[PDB]
């Protein structure tokens, strides 16, 4: 369980340099976090899927291929209050 | 006597607290440290983020400006300007 | 056009891509790769925010779906111009 602070979006922001005004603090706003904020929240999920024994690999040379994201229909965006 | 601006107005009481070469070094360095800061919180208070594309091409196009947070009205007295803000 | 960053260093700390290719001068002339190569996840982060203003018109919540290839290696500092159909 990460916690989406206001501090992590904006160090995130500043990061990629993403400028736009809906995940900068802003007061009459709800402050919204990035969807590339996905792979933060769930990059230990993702990377120990190649770890175990059966998938045997020299580790040293894999090439990060392709990565998709994809909203469920009917889902908010992140928030700065969502236990995640 | 003298005055500033929006901003110089710290280079006018930088220079009526300047005396010699010495003292006069001593007030701007207080003077360049304390538009430092702000600097810094103006823009740590309200950072400018992106403008959506549609707006500034418009802005250019209509023979306006690039959209920043201050806009200047020529040629209109204060208090028609007051009725349309 | 979007431009690479200069080091890879803030990118890994913020979303725990501690890959030594990308930061370490060692591992990546181990495995024989360019150089300190740029992260794929920040060309996912710049790229998506190149969509997000010049074609959502600058509106964060109409990208819904967003996927690429990290088909090429970018060094930093590289110049990175983009196409959008």
């Avoid at chain 2, 992106?50 to 250019?60: E, I, R």
């Avoid at chain 3, 819904?64 to 930093?76: E, N």
Wanted: hydrophobic share 40%; charged share 20%.
């Amino acid at each position: 369980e990460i916690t989406i602070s206001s501090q992590t979006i904006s160090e995130f922001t500043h990061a990629i340099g993403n400028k736009c005004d809906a995940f900068v603090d802003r007061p009459g706003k709800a402050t919204l976090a990035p969807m590339d904020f996905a792979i933060v929240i769930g990059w230990k999920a993702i990377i120990k899927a190649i770890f175990p024994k059966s998938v045997d690999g020299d580790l040293l040379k894999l090439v990060h291929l392709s990565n998709g994201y994809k909203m469920i229909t009917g889902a908010a965006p992140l928030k700065k209050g969502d236990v995640v | 006597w003298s005055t500033g601006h929006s901003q110089g107005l710290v280079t006018a009481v930088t220079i009526a607290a300047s005396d010699s070469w010495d003292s006069f070094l001593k007030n701007s360095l207080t003077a360049v440290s304390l538009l430092l800061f702000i600097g810094s919180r103006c823009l740590s208070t309200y950072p400018r983020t992106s403008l959506p594309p549609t707006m500034l091409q418009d802005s250019l196009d209509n023979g306006e400006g690039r959209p920043s947070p201050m806009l200047s009205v020529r040629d209109l007295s204060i208090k028609q300007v007051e009725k349309f803000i | 056009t979007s431009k690479a960053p200069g080091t890879n260093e803030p990118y890994a700390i913020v979303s725990g891509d501690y890959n030594p290719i990308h930061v370490s001068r060692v591992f990546a002339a181990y495995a024989k790769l360019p150089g300190t190569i740029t992260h794929g996840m920040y060309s996912s982060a710049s790229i998506r925010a190149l969509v997000e203003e010049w074609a959502a018109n600058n509106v964060a919540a109409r990208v819904r779906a967003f996927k690429c290839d990290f088909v090429g290696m970018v060094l930093p500092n590289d110049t990175l111009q983009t196409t959008m159909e």
